[PDB]
Protein backbone atom coordinates (compact mmCIF):
# COMPACT_ATOMS: atom_id res chain seq x y z
CA UNK A 1 0.00 0.00 0.00
CA UNK A 2 1.08 3.63 -0.81
CA UNK A 3 -0.08 7.07 0.64
CA UNK A 4 -3.36 8.17 -1.06
CA UNK A 5 -3.61 5.29 -3.57
CA UNK A 6 -6.67 3.29 -4.53
CA UNK A 7 -5.15 -0.02 -5.64
CA UNK A 8 -7.77 -2.79 -5.59
CA UNK A 9 -10.63 -0.27 -5.45
CA UNK A 10 -13.41 0.28 -7.97
CA UNK A 11 -14.78 3.78 -8.54
CA UNK A 12 -17.69 5.26 -10.51
CA UNK A 13 -17.91 8.88 -11.75
CA UNK A 14 -21.08 10.34 -13.21
CA UNK A 15 -20.57 12.54 -16.29
CA UNK A 16 -16.89 11.67 -16.60
CA UNK A 17 -16.71 11.90 -20.41
CA UNK A 18 -15.58 15.51 -20.09
CA UNK A 19 -14.95 18.51 -17.86
CA UNK A 20 -14.25 17.94 -14.16
CA UNK A 21 -15.63 14.39 -14.20
CA UNK A 22 -13.18 13.34 -16.89
CA UNK A 23 -10.25 14.65 -14.84
CA UNK A 24 -11.61 12.89 -11.70
CA UNK A 25 -12.02 9.60 -13.58
CA UNK A 26 -8.54 9.57 -15.06
CA UNK A 27 -7.07 10.57 -11.68
CA UNK A 28 -8.86 7.81 -9.79
CA UNK A 29 -7.37 5.45 -12.38
CA UNK A 30 -3.92 7.01 -11.93
CA UNK A 31 -4.29 6.36 -8.18
CA UNK A 32 -4.93 2.70 -9.03
CA UNK A 33 -8.73 2.35 -9.05
CA UNK A 34 -10.65 0.57 -11.73
CA UNK A 35 -13.16 3.15 -13.09
CA UNK A 36 -16.72 3.15 -14.41
CA UNK A 37 -16.95 6.15 -16.72
CA UNK A 38 -20.56 7.32 -16.97
CA UNK A 39 -21.84 9.59 -19.71
CA UNK A 40 -25.17 10.69 -21.19
CA UNK A 41 -24.14 12.00 -24.66
CA UNK A 42 -20.35 12.25 -25.02
CA UNK A 43 -19.68 8.72 -26.23
CA UNK A 44 -16.43 9.52 -28.02
CA UNK A 45 -15.08 11.52 -25.08
CA UNK A 46 -16.08 8.76 -22.64
CA UNK A 47 -14.07 6.27 -24.69
CA UNK A 48 -11.04 8.56 -24.73
CA UNK A 49 -11.21 8.68 -20.91
CA UNK A 50 -11.50 4.87 -20.73
CA UNK A 51 -8.43 4.57 -23.00
CA UNK A 52 -6.38 6.99 -20.93
CA UNK A 53 -7.18 4.96 -17.83
CA UNK A 54 -6.12 1.70 -19.55
CA UNK A 55 -2.98 3.37 -20.84
CA UNK A 56 -1.94 4.41 -17.35
CA UNK A 57 -2.23 0.71 -16.34
CA UNK A 58 -5.68 0.44 -14.79
CA UNK A 59 -9.02 -0.76 -16.17
CA UNK A 60 -12.23 1.04 -17.07
CA UNK A 61 -15.58 0.78 -18.82
CA UNK A 62 -17.81 3.47 -20.35
CA UNK A 63 -21.52 3.16 -19.43
CA UNK A 64 -24.27 5.35 -20.86
CA UNK A 65 -26.97 6.49 -18.40
CA UNK A 66 -29.11 9.60 -18.09
CA UNK A 67 -28.72 10.58 -14.41
CA UNK A 68 -32.10 12.38 -14.52
CA UNK A 69 -33.72 8.94 -14.77
CA UNK A 70 -33.58 7.17 -11.43
CA UNK A 71 -34.22 3.79 -13.10
CA UNK A 72 -31.09 4.42 -15.22
CA UNK A 73 -29.10 5.26 -12.07
CA UNK A 74 -30.12 1.90 -10.57
CA UNK A 75 -29.06 0.11 -13.80
CA UNK A 76 -25.80 2.09 -13.99
CA UNK A 77 -24.85 0.87 -10.52
CA UNK A 78 -25.96 -2.74 -11.15
CA UNK A 79 -23.84 -2.81 -14.31
CA UNK A 80 -20.87 -1.39 -12.41
CA UNK A 81 -20.97 -4.10 -9.79
CA UNK A 82 -21.74 -6.81 -12.36
CA UNK A 83 -18.68 -5.83 -14.41
CA UNK A 84 -16.07 -5.27 -11.75
CA UNK A 85 -17.51 -7.42 -8.91
CA UNK A 86 -17.85 -4.67 -6.33
CA UNK A 87 -17.87 -0.89 -5.95
CA UNK A 88 -16.01 1.20 -3.40
CA UNK A 89 -16.17 4.81 -4.62
CA UNK A 90 -18.95 6.89 -6.21
CA UNK A 91 -18.36 10.40 -7.38
CA UNK A 92 -21.48 12.27 -8.35
CA UNK A 93 -20.34 14.97 -10.74
CA UNK A 94 -23.02 15.44 -13.43
CA UNK A 95 -24.59 18.87 -13.45
CA UNK A 96 -25.83 21.72 -15.61
CA UNK A 97 -25.72 25.45 -15.00
CA UNK A 98 -28.42 28.06 -15.51
CA UNK A 99 -28.89 31.79 -15.44
CA UNK A 100 -31.94 33.96 -15.29
CA UNK A 101 -33.62 36.57 -13.22
CA UNK A 102 -36.12 35.07 -10.78
CA UNK A 103 -38.97 36.77 -12.66
CA UNK A 104 -38.21 34.82 -15.88
CA UNK A 105 -37.40 31.37 -14.50
CA UNK A 106 -39.89 28.77 -15.74
CA UNK A 107 -41.15 25.41 -14.42
CA UNK A 108 -39.27 23.62 -17.18
CA UNK A 109 -35.98 25.38 -16.40
CA UNK A 110 -36.35 24.66 -12.68
CA UNK A 111 -37.01 21.03 -13.51
CA UNK A 112 -34.18 20.80 -16.05
CA UNK A 113 -31.68 22.01 -13.45
CA UNK A 114 -32.95 20.37 -10.27
CA UNK A 115 -33.67 16.97 -11.88
CA UNK A 116 -29.95 16.48 -12.46
CA UNK A 117 -28.15 18.73 -9.98
CA UNK A 118 -30.19 17.83 -6.87
CA UNK A 119 -32.64 14.98 -7.53
CA UNK A 120 -30.20 13.02 -9.68
CA UNK A 121 -27.36 13.52 -7.19
CA UNK A 122 -29.65 12.43 -4.35
CA UNK A 123 -30.44 9.12 -6.05
CA UNK A 124 -26.84 8.60 -7.18
CA UNK A 125 -26.14 8.80 -3.42
CA UNK A 126 -28.91 6.35 -2.66
CA UNK A 127 -27.73 3.79 -5.20
CA UNK A 128 -24.12 4.40 -4.08
CA UNK A 129 -25.04 3.53 -0.47
CA UNK A 130 -26.93 0.42 -1.57
CA UNK A 131 -24.16 -0.95 -3.82
CA UNK A 132 -20.99 0.19 -2.05
CA UNK A 133 -18.73 -2.12 -0.08
CA UNK A 134 -18.25 -1.22 3.57
CA UNK A 135 -15.67 1.51 4.18
CA UNK A 136 -16.48 3.12 0.83
CA UNK A 137 -16.72 6.72 -0.31
CA UNK A 138 -19.36 9.00 -1.77
CA UNK A 139 -18.64 12.47 -3.07
CA UNK A 140 -21.22 14.83 -4.52
CA UNK A 141 -20.59 18.09 -6.32
CA UNK A 142 -21.81 21.43 -5.05
CA UNK A 143 -20.62 24.88 -6.06
CA UNK A 144 -19.00 27.92 -4.46
CA UNK A 145 -22.24 29.75 -5.43
CA UNK A 146 -24.25 27.64 -2.99
CA UNK A 147 -22.93 29.62 0.03
CA UNK A 148 -19.68 31.49 -0.57
CA UNK A 149 -20.32 33.49 -3.73
CA UNK A 150 -23.46 35.44 -4.63
CA UNK A 151 -24.12 36.02 -8.32
CA UNK A 152 -27.15 37.89 -9.70
CA UNK A 153 -29.58 35.81 -11.80
CA UNK A 154 -28.14 32.59 -10.38
CA UNK A 155 -30.80 31.68 -7.84
CA UNK A 156 -31.89 28.40 -9.40
CA UNK A 157 -28.43 26.91 -9.74
CA UNK A 158 -27.23 28.20 -6.36
CA UNK A 159 -30.25 26.55 -4.73
CA UNK A 160 -29.75 23.28 -6.61
CA UNK A 161 -26.35 23.02 -4.99
CA UNK A 162 -27.44 24.36 -1.61
CA UNK A 163 -29.61 21.25 -1.27
CA UNK A 164 -26.52 19.13 -1.98
CA UNK A 165 -24.59 20.81 0.89
CA UNK A 166 -27.36 19.86 3.31
CA UNK A 167 -27.71 16.36 1.81
CA UNK A 168 -24.12 15.38 2.36
CA UNK A 169 -24.05 16.42 6.01
CA UNK A 170 -27.06 14.17 6.79
CA UNK A 171 -26.05 11.46 4.32
CA UNK A 172 -22.96 11.01 6.42
CA UNK A 173 -25.16 9.99 9.38
CA UNK A 174 -27.13 7.39 7.45
CA UNK A 175 -24.11 6.12 5.47
CA UNK A 176 -22.11 5.62 8.67
CA UNK A 177 -23.89 2.30 9.26
CA UNK A 178 -21.79 0.94 6.34
CA UNK A 179 -18.83 3.15 7.34
CA UNK A 180 -19.15 5.10 4.09
CA UNK A 181 -18.04 8.73 4.30
CA UNK A 182 -19.98 11.31 2.32
CA UNK A 183 -18.69 14.71 1.24
CA UNK A 184 -19.12 17.30 -1.49
CA UNK A 185 -16.65 19.40 -3.42
CA UNK A 186 -17.83 22.95 -4.23
CA UNK A 187 -15.69 24.20 -7.09
CA UNK A 188 -15.47 27.82 -8.08
CA UNK A 189 -14.71 28.90 -11.65
CA UNK A 190 -13.08 25.85 -13.16
CA UNK A 191 -12.07 25.97 -16.86
CA UNK A 192 -14.36 23.60 -18.75
CA UNK A 193 -17.29 23.83 -21.24
CA UNK A 194 -19.52 25.01 -18.34
CA UNK A 195 -16.97 27.78 -17.59
CA UNK A 196 -17.56 29.39 -20.96
CA UNK A 197 -21.30 29.06 -20.39
CA UNK A 198 -21.09 31.10 -17.15
CA UNK A 199 -17.93 33.24 -17.22
CA UNK A 200 -19.63 36.46 -18.35
CA UNK A 201 -22.13 36.10 -15.53
CA UNK A 202 -19.48 35.50 -12.80
CA UNK A 203 -17.45 38.58 -13.70
CA UNK A 204 -18.62 42.14 -13.03
CA UNK A 205 -19.24 43.55 -16.60
CA UNK A 206 -18.64 40.33 -18.32
CA UNK A 207 -20.52 40.80 -21.60
CA UNK A 208 -18.07 43.56 -22.60
CA UNK A 209 -14.90 41.46 -22.30
CA UNK A 210 -13.50 38.75 -24.59
CA UNK A 211 -13.59 35.08 -23.49
CA UNK A 212 -9.77 35.15 -23.11
CA UNK A 213 -10.02 38.33 -20.94
CA UNK A 214 -12.78 36.78 -18.81
CA UNK A 215 -10.62 33.76 -18.11
CA UNK A 216 -7.73 36.00 -17.05
CA UNK A 217 -10.12 38.01 -14.85
CA UNK A 218 -11.43 34.82 -13.26
CA UNK A 219 -7.81 33.85 -12.66
CA UNK A 220 -7.31 37.04 -10.65
CA UNK A 221 -10.28 36.20 -8.41
CA UNK A 222 -7.95 33.75 -6.64
CA UNK A 223 -5.10 35.30 -4.71
CA UNK A 224 -2.94 32.65 -6.41
CA UNK A 225 -3.67 34.46 -9.72
CA UNK A 226 -4.57 31.42 -11.76
CA UNK A 227 -7.74 29.67 -12.86
CA UNK A 228 -9.11 26.55 -11.28
CA UNK A 229 -8.71 23.46 -13.45
CA UNK A 230 -10.36 20.09 -13.52
CA UNK A 231 -7.17 18.50 -12.08
CA UNK A 232 -7.63 20.70 -8.97
CA UNK A 233 -11.00 19.20 -8.18
CA UNK A 234 -9.64 15.78 -9.12
CA UNK A 235 -6.78 16.18 -6.68
CA UNK A 236 -9.21 16.87 -3.82
CA UNK A 237 -11.74 14.14 -4.69
CA UNK A 238 -8.79 11.72 -4.81
CA UNK A 239 -7.78 12.63 -1.26
CA UNK A 240 -11.38 12.48 0.03
CA UNK A 241 -11.93 8.99 -1.46
CA UNK A 242 -8.62 7.65 -0.04
CA UNK A 243 -8.00 5.94 3.29
CA UNK A 244 -6.43 9.13 4.56
CA UNK A 245 -9.51 11.31 3.88
CA UNK A 246 -11.76 9.29 6.19
CA UNK A 247 -11.95 11.92 8.92
CA UNK A 248 -13.29 14.43 6.46
CA UNK A 249 -16.94 13.29 6.50
CA UNK A 250 -20.24 15.10 6.01
CA UNK A 251 -18.36 18.22 4.82
CA UNK A 252 -18.53 20.50 1.78
CA UNK A 253 -15.08 21.63 0.60
CA UNK A 254 -15.04 24.83 -1.45
CA UNK A 255 -12.34 24.63 -4.10
CA UNK A 256 -11.80 28.16 -5.45
CA UNK A 257 -8.12 28.69 -4.72
CA UNK A 258 -9.01 31.13 -1.91
CA UNK A 259 -11.36 33.37 -3.88
CA UNK A 260 -13.97 33.34 -1.03
CA UNK B 261 -47.73 56.01 11.40
CA UNK B 262 -46.21 53.85 14.20
CA UNK B 263 -42.77 52.20 14.12
CA UNK B 264 -43.10 48.47 13.12
CA UNK B 265 -46.74 48.59 12.03
CA UNK B 266 -48.07 47.59 8.63
CA UNK B 267 -51.08 49.89 8.30
CA UNK B 268 -52.14 50.21 4.63
CA UNK B 269 -50.14 47.15 3.63
CA UNK B 270 -51.43 43.89 2.18
CA UNK B 271 -49.72 40.63 3.09
CA UNK B 272 -50.11 37.05 1.84
CA UNK B 273 -49.11 33.96 3.84
CA UNK B 274 -49.05 30.49 2.31
CA UNK B 275 -50.46 27.70 4.49
CA UNK B 276 -51.79 30.09 7.12
CA UNK B 277 -54.82 28.06 8.10
CA UNK B 278 -52.81 26.52 10.91
CA UNK B 279 -49.45 26.10 12.59
CA UNK B 280 -46.82 28.78 12.19
CA UNK B 281 -48.52 30.32 9.15
CA UNK B 282 -51.71 30.94 11.13
CA UNK B 283 -49.79 32.76 13.85
CA UNK B 284 -47.96 34.80 11.22
CA UNK B 285 -51.18 35.74 9.44
CA UNK B 286 -52.96 36.88 12.62
CA UNK B 287 -49.86 38.83 13.74
CA UNK B 288 -49.47 40.65 10.41
CA UNK B 289 -53.14 41.57 10.86
CA UNK B 290 -52.50 42.73 14.41
CA UNK B 291 -49.73 44.98 12.99
CA UNK B 292 -52.35 46.47 10.67
CA UNK B 293 -51.88 44.61 7.39
CA UNK B 294 -54.77 43.23 5.40
CA UNK B 295 -54.03 39.50 5.01
CA UNK B 296 -54.59 36.89 2.33
CA UNK B 297 -54.83 33.58 4.14
CA UNK B 298 -53.81 30.76 1.83
CA UNK B 299 -54.67 27.12 2.50
CA UNK B 300 -54.72 23.84 0.60
CA UNK B 301 -57.05 21.68 2.80
CA UNK B 302 -57.82 23.40 6.12
CA UNK B 303 -60.84 25.43 5.01
CA UNK B 304 -62.45 25.66 8.44
CA UNK B 305 -59.18 26.70 10.09
CA UNK B 306 -58.47 29.25 7.35
CA UNK B 307 -61.81 30.88 8.03
CA UNK B 308 -61.14 31.00 11.77
CA UNK B 309 -57.91 32.83 11.01
CA UNK B 310 -59.76 35.28 8.72
CA UNK B 311 -62.29 35.91 11.52
CA UNK B 312 -59.59 36.54 14.12
CA UNK B 313 -57.98 39.09 11.77
CA UNK B 314 -61.35 40.85 11.26
CA UNK B 315 -62.10 40.78 14.98
CA UNK B 316 -58.79 42.50 15.77
CA UNK B 317 -59.83 45.30 13.36
CA UNK B 318 -58.15 44.43 10.07
CA UNK B 319 -59.39 42.65 6.94
CA UNK B 320 -58.62 39.26 5.43
CA UNK B 321 -59.68 36.71 2.79
CA UNK B 322 -59.13 32.97 2.65
CA UNK B 323 -57.91 31.67 -0.71
CA UNK B 324 -57.45 27.99 -1.57
CA UNK B 325 -54.39 27.08 -3.66
CA UNK B 326 -52.16 24.01 -3.84
CA UNK B 327 -48.69 25.53 -3.70
CA UNK B 328 -47.30 22.47 -5.54
CA UNK B 329 -49.10 23.66 -8.67
CA UNK B 330 -47.32 26.65 -10.15
CA UNK B 331 -50.46 27.63 -12.12
CA UNK B 332 -52.35 27.77 -8.79
CA UNK B 333 -49.59 29.98 -7.32
CA UNK B 334 -50.06 32.41 -10.23
CA UNK B 335 -53.86 32.38 -9.64
CA UNK B 336 -53.38 32.77 -5.83
CA UNK B 337 -51.44 35.97 -6.43
CA UNK B 338 -53.82 37.30 -9.08
CA UNK B 339 -56.73 36.73 -6.66
CA UNK B 340 -54.82 38.47 -3.91
CA UNK B 341 -54.23 41.58 -5.99
CA UNK B 342 -57.79 41.45 -7.40
CA UNK B 343 -59.30 41.39 -3.91
CA UNK B 344 -57.17 43.98 -2.14
CA UNK B 345 -55.85 46.03 -5.10
CA UNK B 346 -52.14 45.46 -4.48
CA UNK B 347 -49.73 43.27 -2.52
CA UNK B 348 -46.77 44.35 -0.39
CA UNK B 349 -45.76 41.30 1.66
CA UNK B 350 -45.49 37.60 0.82
CA UNK B 351 -44.64 35.03 3.50
CA UNK B 352 -43.90 31.58 2.11
CA UNK B 353 -44.61 29.18 4.91
CA UNK B 354 -46.16 26.01 3.44
CA UNK B 355 -44.08 22.91 3.96
CA UNK B 356 -44.15 19.24 4.86
CA UNK B 357 -41.62 17.19 6.83
CA UNK B 358 -40.20 13.75 6.06
CA UNK B 359 -38.04 11.11 7.60
CA UNK B 360 -36.29 8.12 6.21
CA UNK B 361 -32.92 6.56 5.79
CA UNK B 362 -31.37 7.54 2.47
CA UNK B 363 -31.53 3.89 1.33
CA UNK B 364 -35.34 3.79 1.53
CA UNK B 365 -36.24 7.22 0.18
CA UNK B 366 -38.28 6.91 -3.00
CA UNK B 367 -38.79 9.11 -6.07
CA UNK B 368 -42.34 9.90 -4.92
CA UNK B 369 -41.24 10.93 -1.44
CA UNK B 370 -38.47 13.14 -2.86
CA UNK B 371 -41.03 14.71 -5.20
CA UNK B 372 -43.68 15.07 -2.46
CA UNK B 373 -41.28 17.03 -0.26
CA UNK B 374 -39.35 19.09 -2.83
CA UNK B 375 -42.39 20.03 -4.91
CA UNK B 376 -43.75 22.07 -1.98
CA UNK B 377 -40.76 22.93 0.21
CA UNK B 378 -38.36 24.03 -2.52
CA UNK B 379 -40.05 24.21 -5.92
CA UNK B 380 -43.26 25.68 -4.53
CA UNK B 381 -41.39 28.23 -2.40
CA UNK B 382 -39.31 29.18 -5.44
CA UNK B 383 -42.35 29.99 -7.52
CA UNK B 384 -44.15 31.68 -4.65
CA UNK B 385 -41.08 33.94 -4.65
CA UNK B 386 -41.34 34.41 -8.42
CA UNK B 387 -45.00 35.35 -8.34
CA UNK B 388 -44.32 37.51 -5.26
CA UNK B 389 -41.69 39.50 -7.21
CA UNK B 390 -44.00 39.91 -10.21
CA UNK B 391 -47.04 41.09 -8.20
CA UNK B 392 -45.47 42.99 -5.31
CA UNK B 393 -45.45 46.73 -5.09
CA UNK B 394 -42.08 48.38 -4.93
CA UNK B 395 -40.55 48.40 -1.45
CA UNK B 396 -42.21 45.12 -0.57
CA UNK B 397 -41.11 42.06 1.38
CA UNK B 398 -40.64 38.37 0.72
CA UNK B 399 -39.94 35.83 3.45
CA UNK B 400 -39.45 32.11 2.87
CA UNK B 401 -39.25 29.38 5.45
CA UNK B 402 -36.21 27.22 5.95
CA UNK B 403 -35.38 25.10 9.02
CA UNK B 404 -32.68 24.83 11.66
CA UNK B 405 -31.97 21.36 10.14
CA UNK B 406 -30.80 22.93 6.89
CA UNK B 407 -27.43 23.96 8.41
CA UNK B 408 -27.42 24.18 12.20
CA UNK B 409 -28.85 20.88 13.38
CA UNK B 410 -27.99 17.45 12.02
CA UNK B 411 -30.53 14.67 12.42
CA UNK B 412 -30.22 11.07 11.19
CA UNK B 413 -32.74 10.00 8.48
CA UNK B 414 -33.52 13.66 7.75
CA UNK B 415 -31.53 14.18 4.52
CA UNK B 416 -34.44 14.89 2.21
CA UNK B 417 -36.07 17.55 4.35
CA UNK B 418 -32.80 19.15 5.36
CA UNK B 419 -31.85 19.47 1.67
CA UNK B 420 -35.26 20.83 0.72
CA UNK B 421 -34.61 23.73 3.08
CA UNK B 422 -30.91 24.05 2.25
CA UNK B 423 -31.95 25.10 -1.27
CA UNK B 424 -34.20 27.75 0.27
CA UNK B 425 -31.22 29.23 2.19
CA UNK B 426 -29.33 29.65 -1.05
CA UNK B 427 -32.42 30.94 -2.90
CA UNK B 428 -33.10 33.83 -0.59
CA UNK B 429 -29.53 35.13 -0.67
CA UNK B 430 -29.66 35.37 -4.49
CA UNK B 431 -33.32 36.36 -4.65
CA UNK B 432 -32.28 39.48 -2.75
CA UNK B 433 -30.02 40.48 -5.68
CA UNK B 434 -32.72 40.09 -8.34
CA UNK B 435 -35.53 41.54 -6.15
CA UNK B 436 -33.50 44.64 -5.38
CA UNK B 437 -34.52 46.16 -8.71
CA UNK B 438 -38.03 46.59 -7.18
CA UNK B 439 -36.52 47.34 -3.77
CA UNK B 440 -38.02 44.15 -2.38
CA UNK B 441 -36.04 42.53 0.47
CA UNK B 442 -35.94 38.77 0.66
CA UNK B 443 -35.19 36.68 3.76
CA UNK B 444 -35.97 33.30 5.32
CA UNK B 445 -36.79 32.24 8.84
CA UNK B 446 -35.36 28.86 9.89
CA UNK B 447 -37.35 27.69 12.89
CA UNK B 448 -36.27 24.94 15.22
CA UNK B 449 -38.72 22.80 17.14
CA UNK B 450 -41.88 24.87 17.17
CA UNK B 451 -44.97 23.35 18.78
CA UNK B 452 -47.50 22.74 15.99
CA UNK B 453 -49.23 19.68 14.48
CA UNK B 454 -45.98 18.91 12.57
CA UNK B 455 -44.08 19.02 15.85
CA UNK B 456 -46.04 16.22 17.47
CA UNK B 457 -46.03 14.07 14.31
CA UNK B 458 -42.25 13.98 14.24
CA UNK B 459 -40.84 14.79 17.70
CA UNK B 460 -40.13 11.07 18.26
CA UNK B 461 -37.63 11.15 15.36
CA UNK B 462 -35.60 14.03 16.85
CA UNK B 463 -35.00 12.19 20.14
CA UNK B 464 -33.05 8.95 20.82
CA UNK B 465 -35.57 6.24 21.79
CA UNK B 466 -38.40 8.81 21.12
CA UNK B 467 -41.04 6.16 20.53
CA UNK B 468 -40.87 5.17 24.23
CA UNK B 469 -41.58 8.65 25.67
CA UNK B 470 -44.98 10.36 25.84
CA UNK B 471 -45.77 13.29 23.51
CA UNK B 472 -45.75 15.49 26.61
CA UNK B 473 -42.30 14.25 27.64
CA UNK B 474 -40.93 14.71 24.11
CA UNK B 475 -42.10 18.35 24.09
CA UNK B 476 -40.47 19.00 27.50
CA UNK B 477 -37.25 17.46 26.19
CA UNK B 478 -37.37 19.76 23.16
CA UNK B 479 -37.93 22.65 25.58
CA UNK B 480 -34.63 21.93 27.26
CA UNK B 481 -32.78 22.15 23.93
CA UNK B 482 -33.00 25.92 24.25
CA UNK B 483 -30.99 27.48 27.07
CA UNK B 484 -34.20 29.45 27.80
CA UNK B 485 -35.81 26.10 28.79
CA UNK B 486 -39.03 26.53 26.88
CA UNK B 487 -40.38 25.41 23.54
CA UNK B 488 -40.54 27.55 20.47
CA UNK B 489 -44.06 28.63 19.57
CA UNK B 490 -45.68 29.87 16.43
CA UNK B 491 -45.86 33.38 17.93
CA UNK B 492 -42.05 33.38 18.14
CA UNK B 493 -41.69 32.96 14.38
CA UNK B 494 -44.55 35.41 13.85
CA UNK B 495 -42.71 38.02 15.99
CA UNK B 496 -39.65 37.84 13.74
CA UNK B 497 -41.44 37.73 10.43
CA UNK B 498 -43.35 40.84 11.58
CA UNK B 499 -40.10 42.72 12.11
CA UNK B 500 -38.56 41.53 8.81
CA UNK B 501 -41.63 42.63 6.79
CA UNK B 502 -41.69 46.07 8.46
CA UNK B 503 -40.00 49.31 7.34
CA UNK B 504 -37.45 48.83 10.09
CA UNK B 505 -36.34 45.36 8.93
CA UNK B 506 -35.17 46.60 5.51
CA UNK B 507 -31.46 46.30 6.24
CA UNK B 508 -31.90 42.64 6.97
CA UNK B 509 -31.92 41.36 3.40
CA UNK B 510 -30.83 38.09 1.78
CA UNK B 511 -30.42 36.49 5.23
CA UNK B 512 -31.68 33.30 6.84
CA UNK B 513 -32.53 33.79 10.56
CA UNK B 514 -32.44 30.63 12.63
CA UNK B 515 -35.18 30.82 15.28
CA UNK B 516 -34.48 28.11 17.89
CA UNK B 517 -34.13 30.19 21.07
CA UNK B 518 -30.35 29.53 21.09
CA UNK B 519 -30.36 25.73 20.73
CA UNK B 520 -27.67 25.79 17.97
Ligand SMILES: NC(=O)c1ccc[n+]([C@@H]2O[C@H](COP(=O)([O-])OP(=O)(O)OC[C@H]3O[C@@H](n4cnc5c(N)ncnc54)[C@H](OP(=O)(O)O)[C@@H]3O)[C@@H](O)[C@H]2O)c1
Pocket residue numbers: 014015016017018019020021038039040041042043065066067068093094095096097116117141142143144186187188189190191192193194195
Ligand atom coordinates in the same frame (compact mmCIF):
# COMPACT_ATOMS: atom_id res chain seq x y z
N1 LIG C 1 -17.15 24.26 -14.27
C1 LIG C 1 -17.30 25.09 -13.23
O1 LIG C 1 -16.72 26.18 -13.17
C2 LIG C 1 -18.15 24.67 -12.08
C3 LIG C 1 -18.30 25.55 -11.03
C4 LIG C 1 -19.08 25.15 -9.94
C5 LIG C 1 -19.67 23.88 -9.96
N2 LIG C 1 -19.52 23.04 -10.99
C6 LIG C 1 -20.18 21.72 -10.95
O2 LIG C 1 -19.25 20.71 -11.34
C7 LIG C 1 -19.86 19.63 -12.04
C8 LIG C 1 -19.06 19.38 -13.32
O3 LIG C 1 -19.13 20.53 -14.18
P1 LIG C 1 -18.24 20.67 -15.51
O4 LIG C 1 -17.47 21.96 -15.35
O5 LIG C 1 -17.59 19.34 -15.76
O6 LIG C 1 -19.44 20.94 -16.52
P2 LIG C 1 -19.45 20.56 -18.07
O7 LIG C 1 -18.10 20.91 -18.61
O8 LIG C 1 -20.74 21.15 -18.57
O9 LIG C 1 -19.69 19.00 -18.01
C9 LIG C 1 -20.86 18.55 -17.31
C10 LIG C 1 -20.96 17.04 -17.25
O10 LIG C 1 -22.29 16.67 -16.88
C11 LIG C 1 -22.70 15.56 -17.69
N3 LIG C 1 -24.17 15.50 -17.83
C12 LIG C 1 -25.00 16.48 -18.27
N4 LIG C 1 -26.28 16.02 -18.29
C13 LIG C 1 -26.27 14.75 -17.85
C14 LIG C 1 -27.25 13.68 -17.62
N5 LIG C 1 -28.56 13.86 -17.85
N6 LIG C 1 -26.81 12.50 -17.16
C15 LIG C 1 -25.51 12.28 -16.91
N7 LIG C 1 -24.57 13.22 -17.09
C16 LIG C 1 -24.88 14.43 -17.55
C17 LIG C 1 -21.98 15.77 -19.03
O11 LIG C 1 -21.77 14.62 -19.84
P3 LIG C 1 -22.56 14.42 -21.24
O12 LIG C 1 -21.73 15.14 -22.27
O13 LIG C 1 -22.51 12.93 -21.45
O14 LIG C 1 -23.93 15.01 -21.01
C18 LIG C 1 -20.65 16.33 -18.58
O15 LIG C 1 -19.71 15.26 -18.39
C19 LIG C 1 -21.30 20.05 -12.27
O16 LIG C 1 -22.14 19.29 -11.40
C20 LIG C 1 -21.34 21.53 -11.92
O17 LIG C 1 -22.58 21.94 -11.37
C21 LIG C 1 -18.76 23.42 -12.04
Ligand SMILES: NC(=O)c1ccc[n+]([C@@H]2O[C@H](COP(=O)([O-])OP(=O)(O)OC[C@H]3O[C@@H](n4cnc5c(N)ncnc54)[C@H](OP(=O)(O)O)[C@@H]3O)[C@@H](O)[C@H]2O)c1
Pocket residue numbers: 274275276277278279280281298299300301302303325326327328353354355356357376401402403404446447448449450451452453454455
Ligand atom coordinates in the same frame (compact mmCIF):
# COMPACT_ATOMS: atom_id res chain seq x y z
N1 LIG D 1 -42.83 23.19 13.60
C1 LIG D 1 -41.50 23.11 13.44
O1 LIG D 1 -40.79 22.67 14.34
C2 LIG D 1 -40.82 23.53 12.16
C3 LIG D 1 -39.45 23.42 12.14
C4 LIG D 1 -38.75 23.80 11.03
C5 LIG D 1 -39.43 24.28 9.93
N2 LIG D 1 -40.78 24.35 9.94
C6 LIG D 1 -41.40 24.87 8.72
O2 LIG D 1 -42.46 25.78 9.04
C7 LIG D 1 -43.50 25.64 8.05
C8 LIG D 1 -44.81 25.26 8.69
O3 LIG D 1 -44.55 24.36 9.75
P1 LIG D 1 -45.78 23.92 10.68
O4 LIG D 1 -45.17 23.47 11.97
O5 LIG D 1 -46.81 25.01 10.75
O6 LIG D 1 -46.41 22.68 9.85
P2 LIG D 1 -47.97 22.25 9.94
O7 LIG D 1 -48.53 22.36 11.32
O8 LIG D 1 -48.05 20.88 9.29
O9 LIG D 1 -48.63 23.37 9.04
C9 LIG D 1 -48.43 23.21 7.64
C10 LIG D 1 -49.13 24.27 6.81
O10 LIG D 1 -48.69 24.07 5.45
C11 LIG D 1 -49.87 23.93 4.62
N3 LIG D 1 -49.75 23.02 3.44
C12 LIG D 1 -49.53 21.70 3.44
N4 LIG D 1 -49.52 21.25 2.16
C13 LIG D 1 -49.77 22.28 1.33
C14 LIG D 1 -49.89 22.50 -0.13
N5 LIG D 1 -49.75 21.48 -0.98
N6 LIG D 1 -50.12 23.73 -0.59
C15 LIG D 1 -50.28 24.75 0.27
N7 LIG D 1 -50.16 24.62 1.61
C16 LIG D 1 -49.92 23.44 2.19
C17 LIG D 1 -50.98 23.45 5.54
O11 LIG D 1 -52.23 23.91 5.08
P3 LIG D 1 -53.40 22.88 4.81
O12 LIG D 1 -53.70 22.23 6.14
O13 LIG D 1 -54.52 23.78 4.28
O14 LIG D 1 -52.80 21.91 3.82
C18 LIG D 1 -50.65 24.12 6.86
O15 LIG D 1 -51.36 25.37 6.91
C19 LIG D 1 -43.06 24.57 7.08
O16 LIG D 1 -42.50 25.23 5.91
C20 LIG D 1 -42.04 23.79 7.89
O17 LIG D 1 -41.05 23.11 7.10
C21 LIG D 1 -41.49 23.99 11.03
Ligand SMILES: COc1ccc(-c2coc3cc(O)cc(O)c3c2=O)cc1
Pocket residue numbers: 404447448449450454455456458459460462463474477478479480481
Ligand atom coordinates in the same frame (compact mmCIF):
# COMPACT_ATOMS: atom_id res chain seq x y z
C1 LIG E 1 -33.63 16.46 24.59
O1 LIG E 1 -33.27 16.72 23.23
C2 LIG E 1 -34.16 17.02 22.22
C3 LIG E 1 -33.70 17.53 21.00
C4 LIG E 1 -34.59 17.82 19.97
C5 LIG E 1 -35.98 17.63 20.13
C6 LIG E 1 -36.97 17.92 19.04
C7 LIG E 1 -38.17 17.18 19.02
O2 LIG E 1 -39.12 17.33 18.09
C8 LIG E 1 -39.03 18.21 17.05
C9 LIG E 1 -40.06 18.32 16.12
C10 LIG E 1 -39.95 19.21 15.05
O3 LIG E 1 -40.97 19.29 14.16
C11 LIG E 1 -38.84 20.03 14.86
C12 LIG E 1 -37.77 20.00 15.75
O4 LIG E 1 -36.71 20.82 15.53
C13 LIG E 1 -37.83 19.06 16.91
C14 LIG E 1 -36.75 18.92 17.93
O5 LIG E 1 -35.72 19.63 17.84
C15 LIG E 1 -36.42 17.11 21.35
C16 LIG E 1 -35.53 16.82 22.37
